[PDB]
From a paper:
Agmatinase (AGM) is the enzyme that catalyzes the hydrolysis of agmatine in urea and putrescine, and to date, E. coli AGM (EcAGM) is the best agmatinase kinetically characterized.
Two structures in different space groups were solved by X-ray crystallography, one at low resolution (3.2 Å), including a guanidine group; and other at high resolution (1.8 Å) which presents urea and agmatine in the active site. For 1.8 Å resolution structure, the asymmetric unit of the crystal contains one chain of protein, an urea molecule, and agmatine in the channel formed by the loops A and B, and three manganese atoms; two at the active site, and one at the interfaces with the other two asymmetric units. However, this agmatine is in a non-catalytic position, away from the site of the Mn2+ ions, where an urea molecule is present. H-bonds mediate a similar intermonomer association between the backbone from Pro240 and Ala237 and the OH- of a TRIS buffer molecule. The solved structures in complex with guanidine and urea provide insights into the catalytic mechanism of the EcAGM. The structures with guanidine and urea made it possible to propose EcAGM’s catalytic mechanism and provide evidence of the importance of His163 as a proton shuttle and a stabilizer of the transition state in bacterial ureohydrolase.
Author numbering:
A (entry chain A), B (entry chain A), C (entry chain A), D (entry chain A), E (entry chain A), F (entry chain A): 11 to 304
């Protein structure tokens, strides 16, 4: 083989027909953006994450694991959703259709954004297959705005509870450091207390909030402090280090995580690919916690 | 005066109530953006142009003129349109209302984008006051797409002729170097021939196409080659130098230019403010050709 | 209102005649620079802070407060000092005159630099109205050089104690990580110990040093580690995180802070506006600790 | 189709098994680098060109052509050579093997570098299928060093004539502006005269030097002036504009060009993707001159 | 003196003939690079460190020391190794020869890379003069690859123990956060535990592993998290802060450190010189711990 | 020689005691800056030019010359003036003293700025040795301000004629594109006409203005368009290409040029070292036109 099908995330094989493949996990890129009050995310966050992820591919057993995820899980990259270039409605319809087809086939999904709005169609499809979920949500923002429209940025986790896709009472939002509503049922572990508490202390509280519910894990890269993730459309100071974030993600290993995504990487604002690298490393860690179960 | 009202473009006085002022020309910022197939323009193009324009303010008589524009014209900066943060429809309604109020009062407008879509509401208001206009359009793109919707990026100069706002047969598009429709009535002076012909030759042809019609002058900064204007959402190689562009704009002096704008400056892609500087210099040149008449 | 007077810091109203206004607090920009042994700060630090501060304006009650500062305090932005473009003497004379006029009128000041030298004229005016003050000083540098001239960079807090403007014995310098003089009366809480101690421990010591004296709060952004504040003229490694800095500023709430500034933001060295964002967030936090008293 | 095989250059279909496909032209990426006396090219030049090429894909008939290349030519992207990460010998052996297999199958090649050294293995394979070729070589450097080793950077066009792969007497080197050997048989059209002469004049001379020989076209992006192509390992001032370069490439339409490449794009030194964009546009123009024959 | 010999690191005197000088310590630059699977380091890491080090030179007694290193140690900068531009073998032969000549003369060495491969020739020369050493190694990578060739990147600390240059059983690797071999005798203090433990706790363990052996101290700047050191060829998230790193280096004061280096600064990926600044500050701290003994 | 005295511009030997050396030409760096109305130049322009100049050193006979300058001229680099870090008066006194000592010894000078103000002390020393000179001045600015003080930026060529150092009537200013005084005796060849006329036409006019007077050649890099020289404190659009500038400098070969400098390179605003590279190439061309006479 002089040229090869090893062109996707972590040099994994591409499969443009994933639904009836032998894959366990399928990576989908959704380079969807919408006009915001601040900067736009752009159309290259899936591409920047894939490109920088070659920094991680040489490790046979990614630190600190004692196995190779690739020998426990069959992971393929199906490329990008064609309708990510449509408006919020068109993108949502096609993404939910893509997701339902994969979940019905027994595949699970790691998806890369794109604006955080991509998580709402994913949650609609996941709720159909797995039932109402607990949300584990890393972000500087709660995204529970209740006064905007159905397709507005920052409203996904008002709509999701209203549609019964997630149980807010068993959901946790980690790293929040912008105005939020204390009485909507979500448990907000704000960045101030998360930076001051030990990882094990936070993880113990997350496990007790989530319980045994199926979990959708959604990681907005702007959860990280802008020193570690300058490449994002809506930065907020006082965030998490990449050390603390990856340790928190590893601590989620014993949860029943049924799907996950990483969103808001904005390459136009990245500095020496550090934001894309943090996103790729967190995404690989999400695959490792799944493979640790097998 | 220890602090002062000299905070706008070229340190000109700000006036947030311009409609009944003594101004001859009013500068308006429209930091409007929409989701595109490529990069987003962002919300700081008016701000970047204003900021860098201090490089030009120290010249009493801006080169190469033998007068000071500020002693012939009363120019104020009214800030930014509040609805530039709305969708294409909301922005258009408010911008056209703003423009009609200024033109009805006898003011004329230099406006800064923002996406090129801002020119369509401006043309609607200008046609009401001045009648059907000839368009002088600098761009790498013709923006005459006829198969998208009424608020889509790149459709403004299909809609404008259809609404009778401009006469395409007396309009000229300069710097085009992307696919265009040869039979829609616009005269396309593509960048290949514009770079090969003398300025006077091009200007003579523009004057004969435009004739004596009132002219709306719209300058997309991506008319300049990306070496001179890297800060734009839709770059295309093989463009104009800033030398040739400013010489072409100066050659328009004898036309009856009733309004003008400069659009598509994307500061997130700018390099050492050169794109914003070129936009500010072209905008100042547009004021000079007006003041040269007085 | 199609265009509006909401063009300043945090989109607050501009008022170019603040002295007899209804404002409680007035923001002044001083884009003053001087030749240094290292990099120059430039003339856009006030502008970069204002521009990025729109990221904070959408929060009605800025996290983590349970009120809106804008509903307790009348804050206006008076623009920039005209003489910030003069030499150190000319700038100082005009800034002190500006400040005395505001303080005599019962206004208080949040000022943005510009070089740290701007704090000396501010302290001269503040001492006249409030009496000798305790200085709370965040910096990597003590700025107590005693062998340079009266207008040299880095000498302000040798001159201030000599002129009786501050009491060094009740002043504290936080984040210092460059050579300093242990016996000049200032209490130096160096970055090594500040990074190792709890916030509450540091705050308790600051309160006991300062006591009940009126406090001038001056924040050099290079107090933050260059990972969080690369945009500064004189970076030093081993600094504070933005998390720790904002927590320290919040802990100053119960002090009698009569005036404050944020200096040394150098946009030419900024990376994705993170330094300007940290400066804008710290400045907003200073307004919140004032509004928390009302 | 919710996800698709449209992930390569210009969103063309990927085919990891191109040798027995229906393709007419096959794109291969060779992200090969070697230690140099100056900067290294890196491993992302194929990826940066592919990514930015989406700016060109929306044009059905790319300006200024009156047809769609994609409706005359079947072009696929086979990804990257696996051995581009080996040393100069390992890469050369695998690339020549890849190329021979494609040419023997009747495919033709557009290849992207990577260091310019990639052209030597390509020429070895092309000479086998097409016979000794005339080289049309755009570069600031002649790459005819005769005193280094067989795998050294900058020696390819000493070795190629010695191995009988090209006829130097019918080869032309365009844009040269570094020390060269006047008596080695190549015709050097240096950047000084190329910038001063008309395109048609240069093209007429190229046609007479090349005659009817089969042509290998190799474009080092550092032929362009660093204002247009800052993203390259070995910049030299006084180069070609992208306007002149694309016009020169279009003028080669009537030559018998049997293979072509674009090399030396160094994304770590690129500014707002302008170098990658120029490389992608030149590469698309090379496909258009081929499709213009059909 | 109108011009002066104060052109090297920290403005120290240059001496191009250091071997028979009065120097105690000699700084050597080795701008050596080799083709890697990731980015290349480049040829300006010695130059970038020297340039930014002027930020530290103004401190007479560098914080937090109570003496001036320059009054206890005679330090000169001998410039760069001429053969750093050769291949791994040529560079190694000349560097080891340079080092042996200095050590035989009673000088000690602070060296700047360049790729980490430069440490292997340095260790060969140091073992000859000081005997088998304990290695104190800061890195995200263990560089103990045992399946590559003798001159490959990342193999130095497989070869060194095999040649008896270091005792792996008394060596410690700090900050590791990539796949490593647990049973090769090195003690790996990975970044996860180093970030969670106190500095004194880590230092106590290092002292007990190293004992009284002579120590070679080698600092790969990619030990720091990419937020603090973006300018490096092989970044890995979850690293050390510059605060923790400098505190760890200061804690090594009581060890018998016979030579030291700082490697992998890649200026092409640096952001506002922060990586070069951290490297220069760590290097100055290494000189201070030596001067603290005198 | 394992390390070497080849650390200066073009890897030429450093000589910190140049006055009694065997040098014909001596390079001096003057990293002098002063507070301006725009950006500051900084303190690294000499260093950035030296660093990038290694791109030119490998050419034995620099293109397009048929000799090696280094075999006709003995050129050394004496480093930087120690007082460049003082104020305009202190710097001027020391620079003029440095220059007088070199010129009295029969050396000639190529100097690198630093602010353009450095040329005034150089002209004072040159007039003493060579007599009143003709100035050949490349710039976007005339620097003839007559209403500022004796040490202000932009006043040098008001003061120089007043002190009889240059004859304005035989001096020419090339590339001017900012407000200038038409009646002060200088001949202004503005960038508009210089870009439109042939090089030979401009050179013929320069030769006739200058005649046989001794010439001081001073090149402000902001003569180049900001696309080619973004790294400068005072950019102005519509400038010269680097092709045209180097051709103009080569055409000055037959003039009696007694000294020369290159100023205003501001590395903080440079993009991929292109401005420093253009400055280094122009400086090398100035040495070649001198060596062409021998
Ligand atoms: N939350 C954000 N990401 N941006 C600000 C928009 C305001 C929330 N409706
Ligand atoms: N024309 C542009 N600016 N972008 C590409 C969109 C395609 C035109 N409808
Ligand atoms: N302290 C600084 N900000 N810079 C260094 C100048 C030396 C103190 N006189
Ligand atoms: N030619 C280059 N690309 N670099 C300089 C190396 C010297 C030629 N042997
Ligand atoms: N370890 C590195 N620095 N890079 C990856 C190469 C793989 C180790 N042989
Ligand atoms: N000319 C400049 N370089 N800057 C503007 C200052 C105004 C001239 N006195
Ligand atoms: Mn979010
Ligand atoms: Mn968010
Ligand atoms: Mn347009
Ligand atoms: Mn356009
Ligand atoms: Mn300070
Ligand atoms: Mn400071
Ligand atoms: Mn080449
Ligand atoms: Mn080349
Ligand atoms: Mn840049
Ligand atoms: Mn290493
Ligand atoms: Mn490493
Ligand atoms: Mn950057
Ligand atoms: Mn000048
Ligand atoms: Mn100038």
């Amino acid at each position: 083989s002089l040229v090869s099908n090893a062109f996707g995330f972590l040099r994994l094989p591409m499969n443009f027909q994933p639904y009836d493949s032998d894959a366990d996990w399928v990576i989908t890129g959704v380079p969807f953006d919408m006009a915001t009050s601040g900067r736009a995310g752009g159309r290259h966050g899936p591409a920047a994450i894939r490109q920088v992820s070659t920094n991680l591919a040489w490790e046979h057993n990614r630190f600190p694991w004692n196995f190779d995820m690739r020998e426990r899980l069959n992971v393929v990259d199906c490329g990008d959703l064609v309708y990510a270039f449509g408006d919020a409605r068109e993108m949502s319809e096609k993404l939910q259709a893509h997701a339902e087809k994969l979940l019905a086939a027994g595949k699970r999904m790691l998806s890369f954004g794109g604006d955080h709005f991509v998580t709402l169609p994913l949650l609609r499809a996941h709720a159909k297959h797995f039932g109402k979920m607990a949300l584990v949500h890393f972000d500087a923002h709660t995204d529970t705005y209740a006064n905007g429209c159905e397709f507005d940025h920052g409203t996904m986790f008002y709509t999701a509870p209203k549609e019964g896709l997630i149980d807010p009472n068993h959901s946790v939002q980690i790293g929040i450091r912008t105005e939020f509503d204390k009485d909507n049922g979500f448990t907000v572990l704000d960045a101030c207390q998360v930076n001051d508490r030990s990882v094990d202390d936070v993880i113990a509280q997350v496990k007790q909030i989530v319980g045994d519910m199926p979990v959708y894990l959604t990681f907005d890269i702007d959860c990280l402090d802008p020193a570690f993730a300058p490449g994002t459309g809506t930065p907020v100071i006082g965030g998490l280090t990449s050390d603390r974030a990856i340790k928190l993600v590893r601590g989620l290993k014993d949860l029943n995580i049924v799907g996950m995504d990483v969103v808001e990487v904005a390459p136009a604002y990245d500095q020496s690919e550090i934001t894309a690298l943090a996103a790729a490393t967190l995404a690989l860690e999400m695959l490792y916690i799944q493979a640790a179960k097998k």
